[PDB]
Write a protein that binds this ligand. Sequence first.
Ligand code: CLA
Ligand code: CLA
Ligand code: CLA
Ligand code: CLA
Ligand code: CLA
Ligand code: CLA
Ligand SMILES: CCCCCCCCCCCCCCCC(=O)OC[C@H](COP(=O)(O)OC[C@@H](O)CO)OC(=O)CCCCCCCCCCCCCCC
Ligand SMILES: CC(=O)O[C@H]1CC(C)(C)C(=C=C/C(C)=C/C=C\C(C)=C/C=C\C=C(C)\C=C\C=C(/C)C(=O)C[C@@]23O[C@]2(C)C[C@@H](O)CC3(C)C)[C@](C)(O)C1
Ligand SMILES: CC1=C(/C=C/C(C)=C/C=C/C(C)=C/C=C/C=C(C)/C=C/C=C(C)/C=C/C2=C(C)CCCC2(C)C)C(C)(C)CCC1
Ligand SMILES: CC1=C(C/C=C(\C)CCC[C@H](C)CCC[C@H](C)CCCC(C)C)C(=O)c2ccccc2C1=O
Ligand code: SF4
Lengths: 732, 40, 29, 62, 75, 160, 80, 33
Amino acid sequence: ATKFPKFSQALAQDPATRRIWYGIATAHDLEAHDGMTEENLYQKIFASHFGHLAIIFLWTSGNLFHVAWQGNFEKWVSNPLKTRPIAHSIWDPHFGESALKAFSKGNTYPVNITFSGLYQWWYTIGFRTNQELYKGSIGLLLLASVLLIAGWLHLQPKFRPSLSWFKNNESRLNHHLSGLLGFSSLAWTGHLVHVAIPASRGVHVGWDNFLTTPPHPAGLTPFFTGNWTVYAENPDSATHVFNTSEGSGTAILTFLGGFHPQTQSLWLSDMAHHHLAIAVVFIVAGHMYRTNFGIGHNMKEILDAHRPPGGRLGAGHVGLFETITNSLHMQLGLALACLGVATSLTAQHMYALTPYAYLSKDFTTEAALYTHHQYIAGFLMVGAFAHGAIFFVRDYDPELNKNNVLARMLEHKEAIISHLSWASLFLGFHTLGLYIHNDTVVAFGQPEKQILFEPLFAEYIQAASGKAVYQFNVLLASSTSPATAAGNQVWLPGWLEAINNPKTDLFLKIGPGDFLVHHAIALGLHVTALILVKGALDARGSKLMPDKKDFGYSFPCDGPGRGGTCDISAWDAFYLAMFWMLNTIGWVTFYWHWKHMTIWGGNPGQFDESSNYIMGWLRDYLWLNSSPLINGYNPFGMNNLSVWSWMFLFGHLIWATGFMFLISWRGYWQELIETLVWAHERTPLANLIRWRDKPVALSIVQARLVGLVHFSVGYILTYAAFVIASTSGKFA
Amino acid sequence: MNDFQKYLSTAPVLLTLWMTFTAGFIIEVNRFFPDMLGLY
Amino acid sequence: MITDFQVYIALMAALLASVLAIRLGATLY
Amino acid sequence: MIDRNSKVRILRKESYWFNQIGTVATVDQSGIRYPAVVRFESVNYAGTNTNNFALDELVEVK
Amino acid sequence: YIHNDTMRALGRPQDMFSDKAIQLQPIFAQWIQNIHLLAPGTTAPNALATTSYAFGGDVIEVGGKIAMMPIKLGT
Amino acid sequence: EIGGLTKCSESAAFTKRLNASVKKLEQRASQYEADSPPALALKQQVERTQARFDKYSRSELLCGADGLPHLVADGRWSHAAEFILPGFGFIYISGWIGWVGRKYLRAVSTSANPSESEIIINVPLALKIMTTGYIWPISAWQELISNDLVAVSEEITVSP
Amino acid sequence: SHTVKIYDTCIGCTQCVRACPTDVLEMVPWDGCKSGQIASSPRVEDCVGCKRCETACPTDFLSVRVYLGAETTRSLGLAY
Amino acid sequence: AASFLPSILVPLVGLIFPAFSMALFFLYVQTDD
Ligand code: CLA
Ligand code: CLA
Ligand code: CLA
Ligand code: CLA
Ligand code: CLA
Ligand code: CLA
Ligand SMILES: CCCCCCCCCCCCCCCC(=O)OC[C@H](COP(=O)(O)OC[C@@H](O)CO)OC(=O)CCCCCCCCCCCCCCC
Ligand SMILES: CC(=O)O[C@H]1CC(C)(C)C(=C=C/C(C)=C/C=C\C(C)=C/C=C\C=C(C)\C=C\C=C(/C)C(=O)C[C@@]23O[C@]2(C)C[C@@H](O)CC3(C)C)[C@](C)(O)C1
Ligand SMILES: CC1=C(/C=C/C(C)=C/C=C/C(C)=C/C=C/C=C(C)/C=C/C=C(C)/C=C/C2=C(C)CCCC2(C)C)C(C)(C)CCC1
Ligand SMILES: CC1=C(C/C=C(\C)CCC[C@H](C)CCC[C@H](C)CCCC(C)C)C(=O)c2ccccc2C1=O
Ligand code: SF4
């Protein structure tokens, strides 16, 4: 093309403003660009990945640099529980003198406090001085440059990888599993043993003395001799003060279980052992596929041979090998799905099994991290289903996958969708019904008539791991259980202490109130899934539009006929599911925050009793904890929470603005724009200036996207302010 | 009469009557057996 | 304390990244 | 067999009445592409109750 | 409104559109109010009091509670 | 007890709630006087309150720390009154309604105008069909094993 | 601009050509149907994408399908 | 002194840079190669 969308003649030859809008949003769909060959596609994608990696490293470099140049890491290291971590400095020419003072509280210059947890992580991993952080930043800047060079290099004529190289699954998997994940873990345990653990005990091991400071007194003698037990002897005493030698030990690899008494975090020795074990597992697993050395498995054969003899699963997995290798969308979907689960797990396990020192005592940071990863997880999950649908519309070959496990899924689509619908209905009616019952009776002044179910099943699981409050004498909660006898001399001692300590988030106590919220979360997952799954299955066709596959993943509609076909494309399913995703994640995050807020405040009872009905959430959570935020700036002054206050209102604006695009549709606006064109052409003086791109209204799908973005941005921003200002304003 | 009975047999009318009856009997049960959260 | 020289060195490194970034972008174009 | 007043099951996947039963009204014998005219008791999303199908798309049910 | 919000948040209350800073008084309305207040006995000679105490006058109280009072207009 | 709960008869919080509730009503009644219709009403209300708490106390309900009754639903028959027994009631009634509805729809489907009988119900027939739902469990099973309930891929399906 | 295609299931009802707001469709002689006529789309350069034609088709599935595509002044209905 | 950098760079990054970038994009999208 000769216009902006060089990759699309259709858009390029467009006489309106759409040319600009669409060109920007269709830029990264390399597969649909004019004149795209598969080889070029892969090559360009590979190079683009190098660029993304570089951006990630530049981002990390910046954090280190700004903390080192404008932060208080060293002071924090000295007094971790009495210093507020600094992120970066503030230079806003719009600030008033008062603001300069407010944001400069506790320091000598205006500054922003970090709620990212970097200080704790770096403290745990070994960083003790600002100069060290600087070196890291410089190194990452260099690595970023190297990655950029690689992107250019592999796009050059003699270094462009072949399409075959891009499809050698065995070699990549072997290498990625054994080297990227396995050896990297081994390297990490090396760092922990050589640098981190020594630092925790007061010894400095850096690039200056690492080659002459043995990690363990015995040496590598025990390792090669086979007497590995030596490395687990003399674990740090329970009276050990972190970052000092008082009460220190010599152990480097142990399975103590539990948390360091003073830092209330997992033992470093245990983490080292953890990564060492994981390393061996992955390195071994990376020797499973054939890679030009004779031995190994061929993935195609494995998939083809797996067909249940009964015939209940049809022809089995035959045909899937080719489908996956020849479809980038399916690959992306599988990846996003797994990463989404991982992100949720990080959030869930990181607040219970605190990994970093003094992180549990920083309430605001702990709250931010959870909400951060949970939201990212939602986006990652939705994307997986989205690309799954794109696959069906674009890359699915009905003939190749004949009676395959995948095809049969599309044969009982109605069954799946219908049953998922029933589940959603059941959960919805009863969950809401029970909440309303509890609200009404309480309102009428009769709280004794509430329907409160104890979460017995969950309580049982907690007891099974050792919790004793519930009084369920089972498994690890039983002294006579075979399980207790097994680990009583291994890891249970430490675990049974933490699990039965009320001041830890390991298996928090649950009650009737938790039962209901969990069932609400269930509703969210099921309903969000219904929308996404339906979109995927009904993406290649439906009774209303039996030829949907010929129109694509995203199209405005199919006309006002046959009853009306608005929002009938698969893209619209993503659009609709996004709202539900936000709602469910919101419920999850609200639950975590309120529960923890009450615990931190010392009144766990408030949640226990007020969480049973809806008014409680509104009055004892949203209304009560909004007081610090809404008073960031008042008719009498301002404080450091002013920025957070302003953002809260800003979020509401964006959210509501989104509604305009969602409820108002194109026809109205197009007609109005026409009148404006008339005016400009008929008004003297302004007539001198004219447009080169005809002014037109936004398209149907465009408006949907714009609206969803406005809704989403406002949603996240408003909650971000609340979770931070409320927690910090009250407990910090 | 026949025609009126047909009108009374229309869906909307029958629903209202049935629901009124159902609502009434539920209310009456609670009037005589009140405050129950279980079968005792 | 990060010295001025250290800060200036960092800035020089960033510049290299920038020039190498423009090229990658223009090569992908 | 397809014939007037016969009952058949549609075999056109794009049809609203796929795997459903209809009554053959008339079958044209002039070589038109879709000779049979089947009538259904249920309206489609458009409100029609009839369509013309080829003999292969129809299987007699009895 | 947005200007004022930003200013108060930035610690610059003297730059707000308020009765204590840049002020935007409703002069026209204030004028009409005075006209209506002075009407009784002038432009409305046979009347004895204002049509409404909102325009101006005294505070009418019934039962210790205020029924009507002059309502003033500002920025 | 199960879950560390306590029987409501032995929970102090439960009793405290009772006393407090009654006190509130009584304090209100003090304003009104003697046989004043308002006072008599409030007096009757306290009786109901006392009865409710007593019923729950004599029951097997288990209260928590808040002194509020908590229900148990793990399948134990010790607390079957809380969920299992009432649950059977719902299933029986719900099945009755569904079964009779399906029966009527299928019955009027073969009529002169199958759509007029859905907007204007044939009351006589409906009542007859409605009464025959008390044995829905038996009828349903019989219909399943007779291959008359579940259809066999002779139903419309999507293009893919 | 847009693409309009006619399929063999046409019955020559002429309803589509009588609904087009911009004269894009015509009725041409044919022998595959009893009516002896089929629809054609000689002037797709004037299609605005209304889909009124599709709404008028009586066939089980539209015999006339409009696939929206490249946009021009004519297709975007711009009088300015 | 490095301390002066915040007051020399921020004006450029938030005002000069964005302006020139937007101008270039406009010229790029308004050109007919
Ligand atoms: C040992 C050699 C080796 C190594 C180290 C790598 C390393 C890499 N390759 Mg690779 N590659 C290799 C050999 C190797 N390759 C070979 C031989 C081939 C040819 C067959 C390729 C072909 C190839 C392609 C075509 C591409 C790569 C890409 C990449 C990069 C992935 C992006 C990244 O940084 O993520 C690294 C991420 C991490 C280290 C974090 C991992 C986090 C996970 C979630 C941990 C999970 C732990 C555990 C399982 C979770 C438990 C809980 C669970 C149950 C939920 C990475 C740098 C991609 C790239 O970006 O290129 C620029 C790419 O597109 N490679
Ligand atoms: C590794 C992750 C990954 C990758 C490589 C891709 C890659 C791709 N996706 Mg995909 N996607 C992902 C994750 C990913 N996605 C996730 C997580 C989701 C769920 C949200 C989706 C949902 C999704 C949909 C629904 C669609 C794609 C599409 C595409 C393709 C084209 C993308 C495009 O046109 O963008 C071009 C560039 C842009 C759109 C610019 C993005 C601008 C964003 C929307 C606004 C930025 C936010 C805002 C400005 C912040 C300001 C706030 C401030 C005021 C504070 C491309 C192959 C499209 C397609 O058709 O593929 C077939 C498509 O329709 N994806
Ligand atoms: C408060 C807002 C709200 C509410 C309540 C709902 C409710 C519902 N949505 Mg929904 N939705 C909303 C906003 C909302 N939506 C928004 C903003 C969007 C835009 C993204 C969507 C997009 C959306 C999609 C895309 C889908 C839904 C679906 C559903 C249903 C899920 C099944 C369910 O919960 O059954 C229970 C339903 C309820 C509890 C709600 C109605 C309750 C009434 C009052 C009846 C209560 C009866 C009570 C228990 C007593 C009964 C006995 C009595 C008669 C005596 C449900 C009806 C899904 C669906 O169709 O369901 C399968 C679906 O696919 N919604
Ligand atoms: C008595 C009639 C009847 C019967 C037997 C069924 C049976 C079924 N429906 Mg269905 N349904 C009905 C009416 C009925 N439906 C009506 C009127 C509606 C519109 C509101 C729906 C909407 C509906 C949805 C949206 C879904 C089902 C689902 C289901 C299945 C699971 C059971 C369930 O959750 O139902 C729940 C039923 C409802 C929520 C409908 C409310 C109850 C109705 C109004 C009772 C009707 C009684 C009738 C008026 C009595 C008149 C007859 C009398 C004169 C003799 C099952 C096959 C689910 C499914 O596919 O799972 C596999 C599902 O997702 N149904
Ligand atoms: C992406 C990482 C990142 C981010 C978001 C920031 C953010 C900020 N920096 Mg900073 N900085 C970074 C990395 C980063 N820095 C690195 C690596 C260095 C070392 C060279 C510096 C050195 C630095 C100095 C010396 C100063 C700032 C200042 C500032 C603040 C004002 C903005 C400004 O004038 O920038 C100017 C920043 C530079 C000229 C550094 C080079 C630009 C970086 C390397 C860009 C990174 C590329 C990035 C990934 C592109 C993303 C594109 C994406 C949006 C699509 C702001 C908080 C100022 C400040 O403190 O104000 C109070 C200030 O004086 N920065
Ligand atoms: C990082 C970006 C940035 C920076 C550094 C500034 C800086 C400033 N803004 Mg500001 N502003 C910004 C973004 C920014 N703004 C954005 C995004 C908005 C939109 C919401 C605004 C909206 C805004 C308003 C509405 C006002 C300001 C004002 C001001 C000035 C108040 C301080 C002062 O002494 O005023 C006193 C002014 C001076 C001492 C004059 C300084 C000399 C001027 C700035 C020279 C400009 C020449 C420049 C090179 C031309 C640009 C060329 C082009 C190619 C880029 C200050 C210069 C106030 C002002 O007075 O504007 C000047 C004011 O009324 N800003
Ligand atoms: C969790 C989400 C699930 C989705 C992913 C997992 C897929 C599900 C498939 C897993 C197994 C397949 C299951 C059935 C599908 C099936 O029937 O396949 C039967 C299958 C054997 O068939 P094959 O085809 O493999 O073998 C062919 C024969 O020729 C053997 O050679 O496996 C079994 O035998 C399972 C039987 C043990 C089941 C354990 C029962 C124990 C308790 C459960 C019963 C409780 C009753 C209570 C009394 C009231
Ligand atoms: C699905 C899956 O994952 O399967 C995988 C599992 C796994 C394990 C990865 C596989 C592998 C590799 C192999 C061969 C694994 C087998 C065994 C493994 C793990 C490693 C090998 C030998 C160890 C030896 C010979 C011991 C040296 C040990 C010696 C010589 C000593 O005992 C020294 C010592 O005696 C002194 C001198 C005095 C004593 O006082 C102290 C002790 C006793 C300590 C498989 C089987 O290939 C496939
Ligand atoms: C659309 C689509 C797609 C996508 C899909 C998806 C997205 C999926 C997801 C999925 C998922 C998301 C899944 C999940 C799963 C989970 C699981 C499977 C779990 C399991 C568990 C287990 C197995 C167990 C465990 C345990 C243990 C270990 C021990 C004891 C305890 C317990 C519990 C813990 C694709 C692209 C492919 C294409 C086609 C279409
Ligand atoms: C307001 C509104 C509009 C009109 C909104 C418009 C025209 C946005 C115009 C302003 C934006 C910010 C674009 C302005 C861009 C500047 C002129 C600078 C452009 C520079 C280029 C080089 C990009 C629609 O077109 C529409 C369509 C369908 C449903 C709802 C709606 C709707 O609600
Ligand atoms: S998008 Fe427009 S043309 Fe399509 S169904 Fe909706 S209103 Fe009709």
